[PDB]
């Protein structure tokens, strides 16, 4: 039916209502039916009005168009860009604000860009309202103001002062593993100091529902925090206690992910107590194991590891040592074409 | 939701009208006017006739009809709503609905009519020539309203009580009207000389010509307008000059001093003549049998300046008044042929065959005059009498025509009238001459009917 | 620009206003087509071409399609001396 | 609303309404002066038809327009509401009124089979003149609705539109009706203008998929909706009587397929006349012969075909 | 001869009408291409090009100077016919760029600013020209390390020319050195403030010395109560470079400034007083209150000449912040200053007037040395400073040269302005050249409405184009394609839907003005103003109500809901505002008796403010036609008595008008008869009556049996000529109806 609907659809489009196109576009996106053809004529419409628009519908076609379209998203949100700001800094209604800041700091962080405008005036409103904001509010603020490349050191300084590890459910959380370390690698994206404690105490709670993926981006992150901030190291000793990350080693699966934990786990040195052969063992057999060409990420980051464990001395494990020169040889290979 | 005032849009249709014409009348604002009118509607409000009858007088007056939808529920609500209609109103419905082909536009003048004979005896000066002059226009044929309306003309002006311009309208209206009356027309002519010098030239010349476009047979009046027009003669331009001329020439008398200082007038008006009135200036020479030469020359000379735009009975007019003593100045006549030649469009059955017959019997025969007239003869020969047919049949075979299917149906339409075909002395020398080419052998019956 | 431009459509337009229907081509088009006119200005703008097809109609008018409903007493007229297929006559039956 | 909203009294009195109605004068059957005509059989009808042809022709060609003169034999049907209270006599007039607002007949442009006797096989086949046709032409004619308009679009047998117009408008239609032979229909037709843009689209876009015998739609819906399509056999003939004057007859079986209304089903077959009249025919260079000429010849044609109309074929109660 | 007037332009100078006149001189051949095209630049901005010019110019091209090049471009982005384009085709971007960097880079630097200018309402050449330029930029800025230079070339190609890296290059080079000095801060910072950019380690270095001046300014509280004026001038520069930047990095000092200015107000400078008032403005501080003022009332005459800009802009903006002594002695201020050599620019005098004309009649008349300042400079001006000028220009009466200046260089401010910015404009000149009217305001009117009529295809939003509409309507230029364009351009449903109370009482009153109705866009607006009725407020149901009845539409409940509203506002409505009210709804004959009852009293009551006896008759008229009974409750016979006794203001016409309401009703009032009477008599004595009024007067005394002997005898004379059938007779005749005689 969308498919038949659709040349008619690039004809009707220039005179679509803007509430009306917020449905179309939720429409043909949900069933992956979005061309660059209706985009480009909708979001021109939506850009062209931008004087007086419900400032709803601007930041919902941005949202929806972000995760295909970064381009159109971007520029409807600097299109209606002052006009956020007022309604962020002049409105009265909390609830309101705080939908507005959480939603633009999704499309932030969907198109990996922001104007620094509106990113200030997001950055004081959030401070001035702190309470309200469930520490998922926090966790995407800070997470829309990275991969973004903004710095604001007032607005981290003081969110992460606030986060005083009142995490829902204190001593046993769940959802915050998906939020505790986005805070992290935020502040290890930057150099701030006053955060090992944070970390800590994160890490504590959460070592045993932090899964997969997750860890070993902690880990990096950790690794990097390692570099100014020295109380991270029982943190990093967490991190080389999971139960999660002990039974990832016994069956590992995911080559990304046992490449990042690699890429930490090298520079962290932990290759000299029995248990640390038996972590770092498991996860080279299986990169070998597992056939086919290794991803690029997945190469990068194991030449990076097994260089650092090759000039690593201190490994006198022969056998660990000649699987890190195949693991090398084999990343040579399948890269020679 | 959403309906216009029609009682302040015919109050601003007023003003656009005095604009238009006015101004010069230039088609914006007549667009403009037609645009604000046909969005107008008569609805569930409660117009009064005051301000019905101008809501379609202004709509007609810029082109509205029984087309739109404001003419349509205004020439409604004049069937259903005639008590409301005074006598004022009147003269304005009647003279609308009079241009407008609709059924009700005549059910309406039919009604009107069937209240104006009841009040024609309750009338003062000025609404009796309005209301005159308004079923002038419409070519009603009821007798008892005529009738009695001239009663009330001569009532009113037996003392009086018409201004030297409503004698005018009034003899207009009735000569226009075909009411032959000379009890009317004779009092309006006692009030027109009773108001000395009050009817100017541009006031008397369309008297005249109302008079003699009537028939009334009488040498009294045709007596009386001679001095006026004599004295007239001086302020009087082209147009107004050849009128007079065709209407002298109607009355059917002849003077020697108003036709002198006629010529004399014309003779300085030559440059004007834009040869739509020299067909009347000749034609009425023609008529009477006045055959002075002093201005047909300059006639002839003014044609060629106007030769390219004759009207099509123009030609005809003109070049049947160039057969009597036609001076057969070919110069001219060449290019009149090229012309009507290339003016064979709708023309007319009595044209083309005096055309045709002018063309022959001035012995300047041409090829392509005669073959596009000898085309076009085949579609209106059957709407000829016999002697007409006889006429065109000859100018035929003076163009030596052998064609079967120009020829074919002429002689059915001539066999169709023979005996009044052969009954015409005046023609029996032009028979002589017909069979004179076509020859026995061409349609029998006709031969054999002509040698009995 | 093309052939959908006709006397007939620019008429029909300019008795109905909406002038400004037809892009800056289809009017310099007209102009140069039927109105005779040497060359317009590419330069020129939508309302100035307007104006002057405006202005070159009202003169190609050249003629009253008002029918008077007054009686002017001044007219000389010495000129003057059904089967209902045209249209659909309203109000009848 | 703010400013001086206090000083509203100043007012130029020279403004005057100036509405605008777009949209008004626009469309298909709204271009033209038609004349309609009820002509019955059984002379001084063919002057009907000479001044009502000549003046539309006329009209035709102070519009800037062109057309031609299309003549066929059929018989209508004229709806059961015509007549009211039962009264089989009404004036002429009237009727020509009651036609004239609703349409309220049916035409159906056909002759019986084993007509070709006369045609092609007797005087009448000097009058049908040279068969300049190349043969029976397979083609298929259809007709497009768009979102305002329709068009009309005639396929070659083995390949792309050959043919894709506007619609036909017909200013003059005149119904010649006999009493036992099929009737004789005049009619002066032209073409509205067509955008270039909608022609070459037409001709991009296939129309239909012919695959094996059976057919099908397949353009897409968001063109217009495929409502009559008829397999069609033509054959042409000329003459030319030495004043340009193209009397060219023309026969067609047409076999309806895509069909629309029951009015349309079972095949027919039909012959018809025309010519043609330029921006110029109308202007010096007669163009009444042209109609009277084509009046006789079809007159004649329906008078050859009198007997086999009303035989096992049809009939005719007109008494 | 030419050369002085492009440099005079080049300043900003506006050029008198004789100057054009003195350089047109005949501009024949003989001249070098670079005094053509400095004479194309010159009458670019007046008019068109002529012919003669443009064809010189393109034939012409022999060798062109870089001072040519730059004419050429600026007559080409200036220009809106586009004239210069053919020739500029072959040459686009100056194609023969093979002059290399042998001009000195300040030519360079003109060549790069006369791009900022917006383009008019195959470009290929600009990338080509653009990545030349940034080329030969960083070859030239490569063997130099002056940081003002660097920042004064980066600032001058702040354009859109290069890819953020010449910028970054320099801010780079910039912090290379490591002595940055609070100098070179200052100037580092303005760079990096106009080019809307943020390099982190730039503010990383700039910070600690930022740092140090806030902080020996803040010491300055009671220690080092020594005062360096160069160091408080150095903190105010920064203090309104961060007001109008709003770094995130420089935010502690800010604050902690503001903190320090604001808890010690005892003895701190003039000159910190406005920068600091700008941070206040940002950042919602409610602290601008007390500080200027409280410590700047009247002694603001020892600011410096840079700092007046500061307050300036301060007293434009905000203007709860504005007074009227602040406004009257800041006025003096710059009228004292203007006088002097290094007169301040024109942007901080035309501020000035305008916080001077905000104010409205608090005041007296604007200085005329300011406004001759003013319209002297007038392309110096910015584009929102004359925004702000037009609309304030009406808030304030006694002001025609002013007026007079500023409708004149709206055709040359076309293009340089956006589209919200030319509404505002329009509609505020809507009203002083509305009280104008004259013939100068009419070729101006439609060269605007020529060129908003093309460009319309651009204007989206519905209140832009509805006070544009308006702004035209109150300027006597009606036309029909600048009301049927925008009449379909406000009907997209994109432009639609987006209409409030506000772009449709507009709309309707900018229709309702010069009687251009559309049926199906007016329905539209009904259909809306009937769905939110609930909440229109004054100065609406005036300027809808005196639009939709001036186009006569008859929505029943459309105006039985509008008069309802305005019954409930009668007290916000004004005199003349009930009186026009009541004058639309009775010109339909819309009778509404809840909406007269209602309004009549208000009228009643402020009787004594009528300019004069005339409109009380105007509303006794205007209410008889609603068909309200003149008959009924005092409130009517209040106005009559008032007529009665002041009865020698009404004339001809208002007379008239009382003649007919008089008889119609079967009204007996006898004084208002007998009133009618005496001052007719003194009409006629003046010579100044018309027969149709002594007709009406004679025909209301007969009806209501009332002698009047004063009247009949020299009124009936001049009352028969109207009712008297002169039927013509001729001179015979007259002489024998003398013989009856």
Redesign the interface.
């Given at each position: 039916i969308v498919g038949?609907l659709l040349?008619?659809l690039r004809?009707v489009a220039?005179?679509?209502?803007?509430r009306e196109a917020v449905h179309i576009l939720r429409l043909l996106c949900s069933i992956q039916m979005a061309d660059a053809q209706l985009v480009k004529v909708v979001t021109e419409?939506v850009v062209?009005?931008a004087?007086?628009?419900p400032l709803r519908d601007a930041r919902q076609c941005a949202f929806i168009l972000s995760e295909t379209f970064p381009e159109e998203a971007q520029r409807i949100l600097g299109a209606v860009e002052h006009r956020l700001c007022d309604d962020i800094?002049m409105n009265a209604d909390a609830n309101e604000v705080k939908t507005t800041i959480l939603d633009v700091c999704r499309v932030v962080s969907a198109t990996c860009k922001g104007p620094?405008?509106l990113l200030?005036s997001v950055?004081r409103r959030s401070m001035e309202l702190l309470p309200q904001l469930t520490p998922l509010d926090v966790a995407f603020v800070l997470k829309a103001f990275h991969l973004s490349s903004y710095?604001?050191?007032?607005?981290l300084r003081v969110l992460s002062s606030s986060l005083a590890a009142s995490f829902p459910t204190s001593n046993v959380t769940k959802e915050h593993g998906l939020a505790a370390s986005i805070v992290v690698q935020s502040l290890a994206h930057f150099y701030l100091s006053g955060c090992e404690e944070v970390v800590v105490t994160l890490v504590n709670a959460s070592v045993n529902v932090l899964e997969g993926l997750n860890l070993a981006l902690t880990l990096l992150a950790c690794v990097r925090l390692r570099c100014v901030s020295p109380g991270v190291d029982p943190a990093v000793d967490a991190l080389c206690s999971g139960a999660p990350m002990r039974r990832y080693v016994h069956n590992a699966h995911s080559m990304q992910v046992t490449s990042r934990i690699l890429y930490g786990l090298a520079h962290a040195g932990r290759c000299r107590s029995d248990e640390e052969v038996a972590i770092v063992l498991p996860l080279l057999k299986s990169v070998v194991r597992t056939p086919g060409a290794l991803r690029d990420d997945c190469r990068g980051f194991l030449l990076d590891a097994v260089t650092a464990l090759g000039a690593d001395g201190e490994c006198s494990n022969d056998a660990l040592q000649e699987q890190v020169r195949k693991v090398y040889e084999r990343l040579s290979q399948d890269g020679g074409k | 939701v959403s309906h216009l005032s029609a009682r302040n849009i015919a109050t601003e249709a007023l003003q656009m009208k005095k604009l238009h014409q006015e101004r010069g009348g230039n088609p914006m604002l007549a667009q403009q006017a037609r645009r604000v009118l046909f969005a107008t509607s008569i609805a569930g409000q409660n117009l009064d006739a005051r301000s019905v009858a101008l809501l379609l007088n202004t709509a007609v007056y810029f082109g509205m009809e029984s087309d739109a939808k404001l003419v349509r529920e205004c020439i409604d609500y004049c069937l259903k709503n005639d008590k409301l209609i005074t006598v004022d109103v009147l003269p304005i419905v009647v003279t609308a609905c009079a241009t407008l082909k609709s059924r009700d536009a005549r059910e309406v003048i039919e009604m009107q009519a069937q209240k104006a004979a009841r009040n024609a005896k309750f009338l003062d000066a000025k609404d009796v020539t309005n209301i005159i002059s308004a079923f002038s226009k419409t070519g009603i044929n009821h007798e008892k309203l005529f009738a009695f309306l001239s009663r009330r003309v001569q009532t009113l002006a037996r003392v009086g009580e018409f201004e030297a311009a409503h004698l005018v309208i009034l003899a207009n209206a009735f000569s226009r009207l075909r009411y032959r009356d000379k009890f009317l027309f004779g009092a309006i002519a006692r009030r027109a000389m009773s108001l000395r010098e009050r009817v100017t030239v541009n006031e008397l010349v369309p008297l005249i010509v109302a008079f003699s476009k009537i028939g009334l047979k009488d040498p009294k009046l045709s007596k009386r307008f001679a001095t006026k027009a004599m004295e007239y003669v001086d302020q009087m331009n082209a147009e107004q000059v050849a009128s007079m001329f065709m209407a002298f020439a109607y009355f059917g008398i002849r003077y020697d001093q108003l036709f002198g200082v006629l010529t004399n007038r014309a003779v300085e008006l030559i440059d004007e003549f834009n040869a739509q009135y020299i067909s009347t200036t000749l034609n009425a020479f023609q008529r009477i049998g006045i055959n002075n030469p002093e201005l047909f020359d300059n006639l002839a000379e003014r044609a060629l300046a106007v030769v390219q735009d004759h009207d099509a009975r123009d030609i005809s007019k003109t070049v049947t008044a160039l057969a009597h003593f036609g001076l057969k100045d070919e110069e001219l006549f060449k290019r009149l042929a090229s012309h009507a030649a290339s003016i064979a469009d709708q023309f007319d059955a009595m044209g083309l065959v005096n055309t045709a017959h002018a063309f022959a019997r001035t012995n300047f025969l041409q090829q392509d005059m005669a073959v596009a007239l000898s085309e076009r003869s085949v579609y209106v020969c059957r709407l000829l009498d016999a002697g007409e047919t006889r006429r065109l049949l000859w100018a035929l075979a003076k163009f030596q025509v052998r064609d079967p299917k120009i020829l074919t149906p002429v002689f059915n339409r001539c066999l169709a009238l023979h005996y009044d075909f052969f009954a015409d002395p005046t023609g029996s020398e032009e028979i002589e001459e017909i069979f004179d080419f076509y020859g026995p052998n061409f349609c029998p019956p006709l031969y054999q009917l002509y040698i009995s | 620009d093309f052939s959908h431009i006709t006397r007939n459509t620019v008429w029909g337009l300019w008795n109905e206003g909406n002038l400004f229907s037809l892009s800056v081509p289809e009017l310099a088009f007209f102009l140069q087509e039927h109105c005779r006119v040497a060359n317009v200005d590419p330069r020129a703008k939508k309302s100035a071409l307007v104006r002057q097809v405006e202005e070159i109609l009202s003169a190609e008018q050249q003629a009253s399609a008002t029918v008077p409903q007054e009686d002017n007493p001044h007219a000389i007229v010495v000129t003057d001396y059904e089967y209902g297929d045209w249209g659909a006559e309203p109000g009848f039956e | 609303g703010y400013g001086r909203w206090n000083q509203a009294s100043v007012m130029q009195p020279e403004t005057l309404l100036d509405l605008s109605q777009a949209g008004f004068y626009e469309g298909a059957a709204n271009m033209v002066p038609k004349a309609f005509q009820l002509l019955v059989s059984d002379v001084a009808i063919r002057s009907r038809y000479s001044k009502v042809l000549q003046w539309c022709c006329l009209n035709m060609s102070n519009l800037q327009m062109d057309g031609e003169l299309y003549v066929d034999f059929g018989k209508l049907l004229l709806k059961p509401s015509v007549m009211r209270k039962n009264r089989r006599i009404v004036s002429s007039y009237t009727l020509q009124q009651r036609l004239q607002v609703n349409h309220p007949y049916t035409w159906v442009p056909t002759l019986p089979e084993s007509c070709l006797s006369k045609i092609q096989e007797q005087f009448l086949q000097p009058e049908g003149f040279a068969p300049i046709g190349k043969g029976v032409q397979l083609t298929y004619s259809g007709t497009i609705k768009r979102s305002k308009d329709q068009l009309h679009v005639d396929l070659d047998n083995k390949g792309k539109v050959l043919a894709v117009n506007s619609a036909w408008v017909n200013l003059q239609t005149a119904w010649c009706t006999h009493a036992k032979g099929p009737d004789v229909r005049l009619l002066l037709r032209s073409r509205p203008p067509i955008r270039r843009q909608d022609v070459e689209l037409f001709a991009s876009t296939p129309i239909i998929k012919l695959a094996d015998d059976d057919v099908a739609d397949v353009l897409?819906?968001?063109h217009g909706q495929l409502v009559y399509l008829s397999e069609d056999e033509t054959r042409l003939f000329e003459r030319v009587s030495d004043r340009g004057v193209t009397i060219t007859v023309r026969e067609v079986k047409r076999q309806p397929l895509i069909i629309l209304r029951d009015e349309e089903e079972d095949p027919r077959v039909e012959y018809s006349l025309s010519a043609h009249i330029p921006a110029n025919a109308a202007k010096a260079t007669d163009v009444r012969a042209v109609g009277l000429t084509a009046f006789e010849l079809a007159g004649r044609l329906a008078g050859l075909v009198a007997e086999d109309f009303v035989r096992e074929y049809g009939c005719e109660a007109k008494l | 001869t030419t050369s002085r007037a492009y440099s005079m332009l080049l300043l900003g100078q506006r050029l008198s009408e004789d100057i054009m006149f003195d350089v047109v001189q005949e501009q024949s051949e003989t001249i070098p291409v670079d005094v053509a095209a400095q004479a194309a630049c010159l009458f670019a901005e007046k008019g068109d090009i002529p012919e003669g010019v443009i064809l010189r110019l393109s034939a012409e091209l022999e060798h062109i100077s870089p001072q040519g090049v730059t004419a050429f471009v600026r007559a080409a982005r200036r220009d809106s016919s586009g004239a210069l384009l053919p020739h500029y085709a072959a040459v686009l971007n100056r194609f023969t760029e093979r002059d290399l960097c042998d001009t000195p880079l300040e030519t360079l630097l003109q060549m790069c600013e006369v791009f900022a200018l917006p383009a008019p309402r195959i470009n290929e050449s600009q990338s080509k020209f653009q990545k030349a330029l940034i080329v030969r930029l960083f070859s030239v800025i490569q063997g130099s390390r002056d940081v003002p230079f660097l920042c004064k070339v980066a600032k001058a190609v702040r354009a859109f020319d290069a890819n953020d890296e010449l910028i970054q290059f320099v801010c780079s080079s910039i912090c290379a050195q490591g002595a940055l000095s609070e100098c070179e801060a200052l100037i580092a910072f303005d760079m990096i403030r106009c080019c809307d950019f943020?390099y982190?380690p730039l503010l990383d270095a700039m910070e600690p010395v930022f740092r140090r001046l806030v902080e020996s300014v803040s010491a300055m509280l009671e220690g080092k109560s020594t005062i360096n004026d160069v160091e408080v001038r150095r903190c105010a520069c920064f203090a309104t470079l961060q007001s109008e930047f709003?770094c995130?990095?420089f935010?502690?000092l800010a604050s902690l400034l503001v903190h320090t200015v604001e808890k010690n107000v005892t003895g701190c400078p003039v000159e910190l007083i406005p920068s600091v008032g700008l941070l206040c403005v940002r950042t919602?501080r409610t602290s601008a209150l007390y500080i200027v003022g409280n410590k700047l009332e009247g002694n603001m005459q020892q600011l410096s000449d840079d700092a007046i800009g500061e307050l300036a802009r301060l007293l434009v903006g905000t203007e709860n912040l504005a007074t009227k002594e602040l406004a009257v002695e800041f006025q003096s201020v710059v009228v004292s200053r203007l006088l002097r050599q290094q007169s301040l620019p024109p942007d901080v005098v035309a501020l000035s007037a305008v916080v001077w004309l905000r104010q409205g009649d608090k005041v007296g008349t604007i200085d005329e040395r300011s406004v001759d300042y003013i319209i002297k400079w007038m392309y110096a001006i910015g584009s929102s400073v004359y925004t702000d000028l037009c609309l304030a220009v009406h808030l304030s009466a006694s002001v025609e040269s002013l007026s007079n200046a500023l409708i004149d260089d709206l055709p040359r401010r076309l293009e340089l302005l956006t589209t919200?910015e030319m509404a505002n404009a329009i509609f505020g000149l809507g009203e002083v050249s509305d009280m104008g009217a004259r013939l100068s305001h009419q070729l101006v009117a439609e060269r605007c409405s020529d060129y908003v009529v093309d460009h319309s295809q651009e204007f989206?939003?519905?209140?832009?184009i509805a006070r544009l509409l308006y702004g035209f309507s109150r300027m006597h230029c009606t036309k029909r394609s600048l009301y049927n364009v925008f009449a379909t351009r406000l009907a997209?449903?994109?432009?639609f839907?987006?209409l409030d109370q506000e772009a449709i009482s507009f709309a309707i009153a900018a229709f309702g003005r010069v009687k251009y109705l559309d049926k199906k866009l007016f329905d539209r607006f009904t259909r809306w103003i009937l769905d939110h009725s609930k909440d229109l407020n004054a100065a609406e149901l005036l300027l809808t109500i005196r639009g939709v009845s001036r186009v006569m539409l008859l929505n029943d409940q459309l105006y039985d809901d509008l008069g309802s509203k305005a019954a409930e506002k009668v007290k916000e409505f004004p005199i003349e505002s009930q009186c026009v009210l009541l004058s639309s709804f009775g010109s339909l004959g819309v009778e509404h008796e809840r909406l007269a009852s209602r309004m009549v009293s208000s009228i009643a009551e402020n009787r004594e403010e009528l300019t004069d006896a005339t409109k009380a008759v105007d509303v006794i008229t205007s209410l008889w036609s609603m068909n309200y009974d003149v008959e009924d409750d005092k409130h009517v016979a209040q106005l009559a008595d008032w007529v009665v006794q002041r009865a020698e203001e009404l004339t001809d016409e208002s007379i008239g008008k009382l003649c007919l309401v008089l008889s119609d009703t079967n009204w007996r009032h006898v004084p208002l008869v007998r009133a009618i009477a005496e001052q007719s008599v003194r009409l006629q004595g003046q010579q100044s009556i018309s027969p149709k009024c002594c007709r009406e007067v004679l025909d209301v005394l007969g009806t209501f049996m009332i002698h009047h002997q004063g009247a009949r005898e020299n009124l009936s004379a001049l009352g028969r000529s109207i009712s008297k059938e002169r039927i013509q007779l001729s001179e015979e005749e007259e002489q024998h109806l003398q013989l009856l005689l």
């Open positions: 038949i040349p008619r004809e220039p005179e679509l209502i803007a419409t062209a009005t004087a007086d628009v800094d620094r405008r200030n950055a710095r604001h050191l007032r607005l | - | - | 897409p819906p968001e | 943020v982190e709003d995130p990095d935010e502690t919602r919200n989206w939003s519905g209140k832009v997209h449903r994109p432009v839907s987006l």
